[PDB]
A paper describes a structure:
Each of these enzymes catalyzes as their main activity the cyclization of N-γ-acetyl-L-2,4-diaminobutyric acid (N-γ-ADABA), the reaction product of the 2,4-diaminobutyrate acetyltransferase (EctA), to ectoine with the concomitant release of a water molecule. We demonstrate here for the first time that the ectoine synthase is a metal-dependent enzyme, with iron as the most likely physiologically relevant co-factor. The [name] protein forms a dimer in solution and our structural analysis identifies it as a member of the cupin superfamily.
We therefore cannot exclude that this crystal structure does not represent the fully closed state of the ectoine synthase; consequently, we tentatively termed it the “semi-closed” (Sa)[name] structure. In the “semi-closed” structure, a longer carboxy-terminal tail is visible in the electron density, folding into a small helix (α-II) that closes the active site of the (Sa)[name] protein. The formation of this α-II helix induces a reorientation and shift of a long unstructured loop (as observed in the “open” structure) connecting β4 and β6, resulting in the formation of the stable β-strand β5 as observed in the “semi-closed”state of the (Sa)[name] protein. In the “semi-closed” crystal structure, (Sa)[name] has crystallized as a dimer of dimers within the asymmetric unit. This dimer is composed of two monomers arranged in a head-to-tail orientation and is stabilized via strong interactions mediated by two antiparallel β-strands, β-strand β1 (sequence 1MIVRN5) from monomer A and β-strand β8 from monomer B (sequence 82GVMYAL87). In the “semi-closed” structure of (Sa)[name], each of the four monomers in the asymmetric unit contains a relative strong electron density positioned within the cupin barrel. Only the refinement of Fe2+ resulted in a visibly improved electron density, however with a low degree of occupancy. However, in the “semi-closed” (Sa)[name] structure where the carboxy-terminal loop is largely resolved, a long stretched electron density feature was detected in the predicted active site of the enzyme; it remained visible after crystallographic refinement.
Author numbering:
A (entry chain B): 1 to 113
B (entry chain A): 1 to 121
Write the structure that this text describes.
């Protein structure tokens, strides 16, 4: 049984920070679950151009609002709590957070990092 | 790209109900991600005794408080928002929600039919 908590994780090197986002890795490849599990913050007013060549991702919006754009079609979908999007086709997409957006993210294969 | 909505799903047959909990299936086996993805309410006052022989489950607590007990040792861990537990050893465990607890759950392999529903309380 593994038990961790966000507060403690954000005080370690399993919390990664970058330009436009921060991600707290609750689980990584080493934990052996066969997926990684992340709590990722997307910063208000960012333009996050994303594309996961090497993973499938699922994202559940926990807090905040914005939009995600599917570049295959240009369709824009609203993001609000309870919206779930899955990048099943290694989709190129663009997230524009209006407020900060808090997400729970699942990656397969696991981020191993 | 798949885009779903928790609030719409809660109104459908994909919101699975048992004594002690109501679990929304957001991602299904057939979505081909290699895991299933759920939002589950565990009801205040419950005692949920669970053990998955054939699935690894990770759980992030989104709202509410209670405890989880690891029955290998009897250790009791606090559940509150931000706590993540992973059942990496097919652990036998007991969740006791103080208030309603809301979770985001991941199963590997994906949940399908009825095996983890029955293994849950």
């Amino acid at each position: 049984m593994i038990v961790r908590n966000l507060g403690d994780i954000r005080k370690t090197d399993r919390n990664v920070r970058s330009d436009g986002w921060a991600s707290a890795r609750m689980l990584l490849k080493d934990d052996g679950m066969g997926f990684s599990f992340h709590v990722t913050t997307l910063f208000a007013g960012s333009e996050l151009r994303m594309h996961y060549q090497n993973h499938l991702e699922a994202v559940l919006v926990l807090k905040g609002t914005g939009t995600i754009e599917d570049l295959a079609t240009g369709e824009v979908h609203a993001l609000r709590p309870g919206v779930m999007y899955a990048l099943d086709d290694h989709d190129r997409h663009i997230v524009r957070p209006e407020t900060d957006i808090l997400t729970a993210c699942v990656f397969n294969p696991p981020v191993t990092g």
